[PDB]
């Protein structure tokens, strides 16, 4: 029987690339999504056309709230409903936008709920549910950020969320090791730039990258995820692999 | 004229020692408290006996909620009301207890308390503090030297303290143009929990290379005092460990 | 045509496993050794039995001295003379023993051996490798140590050498990225214990490891080296991958 | 009786500021120097004018070699000879220059100088200090930019990483003797004499806190704090003094 994986925010971009590669490797996948229903279903369709009954979609908002625990529990339950098991959890879904300290129409309470909920609290609750539900190679991969110690100006809540995720990666690695669940991270530097970013600003980032003066492809991020879930990483837990082409080594 | 400082969770233990030391250095102080009103007032009485009208108390829950932003604005406002300025913010108040991943507060309440006290309130207080400055201004965050070798079953607490490291660095970067420095002090074993059994306390004391004892609250406060002082005017985004070498000790 | 790799200190234990896996992946190999001639030759013969003319040995002391640069240049030269190319350098060879700060080798010899093997020889080998390089996938992998921030008592020079090696990994990643040469590390926690060590002392260490209460095999260390040199790590440079079973996350 | 401190490379710049502050704080000082004989002597004169018999100079090359251990021992011995005690060691002296990986000093000499001054000598000085043994401590001058290093400074950066390692390993090992071991890590402080002014201003402009370099005295302030009674529980810590520079992305 084939192992099964949950990938959060898997409709597009890096999350899709992770779902696709896990699928090519032989996993059945839960494609979690929030607003991108059309893309999520189009992805599932494609994967099912390749091997029938190997992909399902699963909608959930991962903003922090009193029901987020139930929503995270239901994501994991959806993987067991569809496939009878859940071997791998990839925490990819993430809000990312500035929250200047000194001054959209979002209240600060909402910005906290979204940026901290998606980047940290949902990963934690999903980790709890994943572990509670449990030959085998169980693991969790958290999508981190190589630039958290040299952060972009005015992104303090986003940065707080990614740091917390480093913390979860370490605490969970420690706590879940006795269950054979490994917990690791992958830290992109610049990978796929925001759709709203203009090409000139993209190029400015690209030129900072020592290894090729270009951003990581979605696939290059996915390759590191696939390593960490594989039997080639069976002694690795609590590790965060930078995939940044050297960006984080470059001084101001 | 005397500068003014806000210390969160200042009624007892390390926050009290920080408040006392700031006051002894010439600061006027806001003593924030949540449940410890009797202690906050007894401290303020003691400080005001030394110098009249140099200590006030301020009550607030720092649990994350819809009203936390307004509570944090008011903490900063209370300093401006009492003393006409706010030069120093010390983020010390903190919830601390285990949140096991695998199995009573509900988990969503644990998130609100642990992530609210250790990260979100410091963020909001940081915003309010800076907004009122939109001179030697600084913020000191009480961090934790053991965040990379955390105690078992303390995920949420650890997440909170890691977020606090992120805020320290992000805010140091962003508030530098205002001359507001942002730094941290990271204790290892200092005052042990009142509820911890005596034998467990000695087990932790025995691990500390430098003296086989915990840090006093005053030794923690000493690093805070350095960081707010004129001797640290080029230091921002720095977290000073005060741990007697504990974090260097392998398993 | 087959790529070629230099592995230092490859006669035994981790280095040998690295050489074997590289060879199994399709690399021709230079097996560098210092004192272990028989084991080095035994390995070369075994690999050449698999595929003729794909393994050579190279003898050299990597202790710091006036001749260390020429020795390192000659190691790299040996790979070019053997195979016409040198795609991968693995800095594995390492002296390891206590050097207490307070009171039969002299301290100047301890400095030379521990700092030479763990840092200076890697640096010199890195210069010589890059100098000879000024669809290729060139890279360097340094064998670091997951425990450098929680070091064993009385191992200061060894620890200093390994920290220096982290600095080299970072500095060389940055400086060699324009040449397409990636530079990374693998940081074991407890892997193969010293051959003399009593089982009872081995067990004290094994029991500290969250993930399975056992040390890493040489092969598990080699797996991470294989990933870093592979096509799946082509955006990874300046990264150190802990392979430690969560050991470094465990407080005193 | 007043405590005594050894400060390496104390004739100029940051080491000088540290020696001056220690002395103002009540220490007798050994002013170590290599080539700067004239500046060393002049500092000792200035300090002894303020308090007589409270400063001496001590000459030593801290390049790695087989006699470096003897030289390091002699620096510590000079403190005991002059003052009968040695309470504080500041490891400040340091070579700093590029050593590109791809092509008048030989590489042998570059390794000796960069690794000797930044790492090996601090190690040997630490050994001799401890062996000859109150508020005893060591402060190592580290570098806030070690994880975002200057291009083509691999040996220098290797030396400074090793120095972090020494700081940690020695804090651990010397704690049973009450000797604390800490670091201070500048970002941009006094720029090289040889650096052009255009390049100096390029670096200044990168510092979030004031768009200026640290003064020597601001670096010395952090050293003074770590040797002080206000840092009695602090060991194995490295205090960045960088105005936020290391937080700034490329
Ligand atoms: N791109 C980079 O250069 C880069 C750099 C560093 C780190 N990373 C990390 O790598 C991961 C992937 O990056 P990316 O650029 O591919 O991410 P992305 O496109 O910004 O976001 C991925 C998905 O997150 C989901 N998401 C957002 N808010 C959500 C909410 N409230 N509830 C549930 N889901 C939500 C969205 O799902 P819907 O579309 O379905 O609404 C979105 O498709 C992220 O964790 C990111 O922080 C990326
Ligand atoms: N003690 C140690 O060994 C140690 C080690 C590492 C780090 N630290 C850090 O150092 C700081 C002080 O440590 P400590 O041991 O002195 O702290 P503590 O005694 O555990 O807590 C300090 C105060 O935090 C306040 N607080 C807790 N929950 C709150 C809430 N929901 N809203 C508002 N205030 C709340 C409480 O005020 P009321 O009493 O008024 O309710 C409490 O007195 C903390 O940030 C801690 O994480 C301490
Ligand atoms: N084993 C572990 O648990 C562990 C933990 C952390 C890190 N590591 C790192 O992983 C790597 C492999 O470890 P290991 O346990 O396999 O190493 P090892 O067996 O101690 O040493 C490997 C080889 O290093 C060579 N070597 C020693 N001194 C040398 C010199 N002066 N010149 C030239 N070569 C010299 C020796 O070659 P000859 O035999 O030919 O003389 C030896 O076989 C090392 O870098 C080590 O520091 C290992
Ligand atoms: N300046 C900065 O921006 C900065 C940034 C990061 C870290 N730091 C660190 O802070 C410390 C002080 O910086 P700095 O700029 O003041 O240092 P510096 O002026 O570059 O060097 C200090 C002294 O080191 C001594 N020295 C050099 N080579 C020597 C050798 N072979 N043997 C003995 N002594 C030798 C020299 O002594 P003589 O003059 O007597 O020959 C020199 O006066 C250094 O460790 C440095 O690495 C400085
Ligand atoms: N959830 C999420 N997190 C992210 N970190 C991103 C990015 C980062 C793109 C970028 C990476 C480095 C510098 C400037 C921009 C682009 N889109 C993102 N989405
Ligand atoms: N808010 C808060 N945070 C904390 N980190 C603490 C402690 C920590 C006590 C302790 C420190 C190190 C190991 C084991 C226990 C005791 N009381 C605390 N209160
Ligand atoms: N060159 C070299 N470096 C090493 N770090 C080692 C070891 C380490 C074995 C060990 C690893 C962790 C805790 C206690 C012992 C065993 N043999 C080694 N050889
Ligand atoms: N021994 C020594 N070490 C150093 N690190 C320096 C410096 C550093 C000046 C500088 C600091 C940051 C970027 C570029 C230059 C200037 N002079 C120095 N001397």
To the nearest 5 percent, what fractions of chain D are helix, strand and coil?
45, 15, 40
In three-state form (DSSP H/G/I as H, E/B as E, the rest C), the secondary structure along chain C is CCCEEEECCCCCHHHHHHHHHHHHHCCEEEEEECCCHHHHHHHHHHHHHHCCCCEEEEECCCCCCCCHHHHHHHHHHHHHHHHCCCCEEEECCCCCCCCCCCCCCCHHHHHHHHHHHHHHHHHHHHHHHHHCCCCCCCEEEEECCCCCCCCCCCCHHHHHHHHHHHHHHHHHHHHHHHHCCEEEEEEECCCCCCCCCCHHHHHHHHCCCCCCCCCCCHHHHHHHHHHHHCHHHCCCCCCEEEECCCHHHCCC
Q: Provide CB contacts within 8 A for C85, sequence distance 6+.
A: C1, C3, C4, C79
Half-sphere exposure of C139 (CA within 13 A, CB side): 26
What distance in Å separates the CA atoms of residue A237 and residue A234, rounded to the nearest whole number? 8
What distance in Å separates the CA atoms of residue B124 and residue B115, rounded to the nearest whole number? 12
Residue-number span of the structural domain to which C51 is assigned: 1-252
CB C163 within 8 A of CB C119: no
Nearest to B120 by CA among B154, B86, B148, B93: B93
CB A108 within 8 A of CB B67: no
CB D30 within 8 A of CB D4: yes
Instruction: Give all strands of the β-sheet with C4-7 in edge-to-edge order.
Output: C55-59, C28-33, C4-7, C88-91, C139-143, C182-188, C240-243
Binding residues of A: 12-14, 34-36, 61-63, 92, 94, 139, 158, 162, 189, 191-192
What CATH number does the domain containing C154 carry?
A: 3.40.50.720
Nearest to C191 by CA among C34, C61, C15, C63: C15
Q: Residue B177 phi/psi, 5° resolution?
A: -65, -15
What distance in Å separates the CA atoms of residue B85 and residue B3, rounded to the nearest whole number? 7
Specify the 3-state DSSP secondary structure of A150: coil
What distance in Å separates the CA atoms of residue C42 and residue C11, rounded to the nearest whole number? 8
In three-state form (DSSP H/G/I as H, E/B as E, the rest C), the secondary structure along B116-183 is HHHHHHHHHHHHHHHHCCCCCCEEEEECCCCCCCCCCCCHHHHHHHHHHHHHHHHHHHHHHHHCCEEE
Parallel, antiparallel, or unpaired for β C88-91 and B28-33?
Answer: unpaired
CB A221 within 8 A of CB A185: no
Q: Provide CB contacts within 8 A for A42, sequence distance 6+.
A: none
User: What tokens does C105 get?
Assistant: 């080798």
What distance in Å separates the CA atoms of residue D240 and residue D164, rounded to the nearest whole number? 12
DSSP 8-state assignment for residue D172: H
How buried is A75 (Cβ within 10 angstroms: 0-12 exposed, 13-18 middle, 19+ buried)? buried
What distance in Å separates the CA atoms of residue C21 and residue A238, rounded to the nearest whole number? 25
* Distance from residue B193's CA to the centre of ligand 6 (Å): 6
Q: What is the CA radius of gyration of chain C?
A: 17
What distance in Å separates the CA atoms of residue D215 and residue C59, rounded to the nearest whole number? 51
What distance in Å separates the CA atoms of residue D159 and residue D145, rounded to the nearest whole number? 13
Specify the 3-state DSSP secondary structure of D240: strand
Specify the 3-state DSSP secondary structure of A87: coil
CB D239 within 8 A of CB D220: no
What is the secondary structure of A175-233 as a DSSP string? HHGGGTEEEEEEEESS-SPPTTS-HHHHHHHHHH-TTTSSPPPHHHHHHHHHHHHSGGG
Nearest to A107 by CA among B65, D61, B187: B65
What distance in Å separates the CA atoms of residue A9 and residue A59, rounded to the nearest whole number? 9
Q: Look at the block and give the residue holding tokens 């420095």.
A: B181
Min distance B38 CA to chain A CA atoms (Å): 31
Nearest to C15 by CA among C129, C186, C212, C149: C186
Q: Is residue D12 marked as binding? A: yes
CB B30 within 8 A of CB B54: no
What distance in Å separates the CA atoms of residue B63 and residue C38, rounded to the nearest whole number? 67
How buried is C38 (Cβ within 10 angstroms: 0-12 exposed, 13-18 middle, 19+ buried)? exposed
User: What tokens does B23 get?
Assistant: 């006051």
Parallel, antiparallel, or unpaired for β B4-7 and B28-33?
Answer: parallel
From the alpha carbon of B9, which atom of ligand 6 is closest?
1
Nearest to A14 by CA among A197, A224, A195, A192: A192
Q: Provide CB contacts within 8 A for C27, sequence distance 6+.
A: C2, C3, C4, C5, C54, C87, C88
Specify the 3-state DSSP secondary structure of D86: coil
Nearest to D139 by CA among D244, D22, D54: D22
* CA angle, A64 then A65 then A71, to 5°: 85
Determine the residue of chain A that is closest to C207 in CA distance. A178
CB C187 within 8 A of CB C240: yes
DSSP 8-state assignment for residue D61: -
What distance in Å separates the CA atoms of residue A47 and residue A56, rounded to the nearest whole number? 9
Q: Taking CB atoms and an 8 Å limit, are A151 and B171 in contact across chains?
A: no
Determine the residue of chain C that is closest to D157 in CA distance. C167
Considering its fold, how many domains does chain A have in total? 1
Q: How many residues does chain B have?
A: 251
How buried is A103 (Cβ within 10 angstroms: 0-12 exposed, 13-18 middle, 19+ buried)? exposed
What is the secondary structure of A102-118 as a DSSP string? ------HHHHHHHHHII
What distance in Å separates the CA atoms of residue A28 and residue A45, rounded to the nearest whole number? 13
**Rounded to 10 degrees, what is the CA torsion of A239, A240, A241, A244?**
-160
From the alpha carbon of C190, which atom of ligand 3 is closest?
3
Experimental method: X-ray
Q: Residue A184 phi/psi, 5° resolution?
A: -135, 175
Specify the 3-state DSSP secondary structure of A169: helix
Checking chain C for breaks where C and the next N are over 2.5 Å apart, the residues before them are 103, 134
Could you give the C-alpha distances from A165 to A117, B65, C103, D106, in angstroms and in order? 11, 21, 45, 47
Catalytic center residues of A: 145, 158
C18, C181, C211: best mutation site toward chain A, by most A Cβ within 10 Å? C211
Angle between helices A122-133 and B107-115 (to 10 degrees): 140
User: What tokens does C146 get?
Assistant: 């997951």
Specify the 3-state DSSP secondary structure of A136: coil
Nearest to C23 by CA among C42, C48, C60: C48
Centroid of chain to Cα B217: 12
Nearest to B232 by CA among B185, B189, B188: B185
Residue C64: left if φ>0, alpha if ψ -120 to 50, beta else—which one? beta
Q: Look at the block and give the residue holding tokens 């303290």.
A: B161
User: What tokens does D52 get?
Assistant: 């007589």
The residue from C149, C158, C203, C223 that is catalytic is: C158
DSSP 8-state assignment for residue A119: I
Specify the 3-state DSSP secondary structure of B18: helix
Resolution in A: 1.9
Task: Please check whether residue C241 touches D, CB under 8 A.
Answer: no
What distance in Å separates the CA atoms of residue C83 and residue C53, rounded to the nearest whole number? 9
User: What tokens does B133 get?
Assistant: 């400055």
Q: Residue D246 phi/psi, 5° resolution?
A: -65, -10
Q: Look at the block and give the residue holding tokens 């977020």.
A: B163
CB D114 within 8 A of CB D161: no
């Amino acid at each position: 029987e084939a192992p099964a994986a949950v990938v959060t925010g898997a409709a597009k971009r890096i999350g899709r690339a992770i779902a696709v590669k896990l699928h090519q490797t032989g996993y059945r996948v839960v494609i979690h999504y929030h607003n991108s229903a059309e893309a999520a279903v189009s992805l599932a369709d494609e994967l099912n056309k390749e091997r029938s009954n190997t992909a399902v979609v699963c909608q959930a908002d991962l903003t922090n709230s009193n029901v987020l625990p139930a929503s995270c529990e239901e994501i994991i339950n959806s993987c067991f409903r569809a496939f009878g098991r859940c071997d791998v959890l990839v925490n990819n879904a993430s809000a990312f936008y500035p929250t200047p300290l000194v001054q959209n129409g979002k209240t600060v309470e909402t910005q906290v709920a979204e940026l901290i909920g998606t980047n940290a609290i949902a990963p934690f609750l999903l980790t709890m549910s994943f572990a509670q539900r449990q030959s085998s190679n169980l693991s969790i991969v958290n999508l981190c950020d190589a630039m958290v110690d040299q952060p972009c100006m005015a992104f303090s809540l986003y940065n707080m969320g990614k740091h917390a995720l480093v913390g979860l990666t370490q605490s969970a690695a420690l706590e879940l090791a006795p269950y054979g669940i490994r917990v690791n991270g992958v830290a992109p530097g610049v990978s796929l730039l925001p759709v709203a970013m203009g090409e000139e600003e993209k190029d400015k980032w690209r030129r900072k990258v020592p290894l090729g003066r270009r951003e990581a492809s979605a696939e290059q991020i996915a390759d590191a995820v696939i390593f960490l879930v594989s039997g080639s990483a069976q002694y690795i837990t609590g590790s965060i692999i930078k995939v940044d082409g050297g960006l984080s080594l470059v001084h101001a």
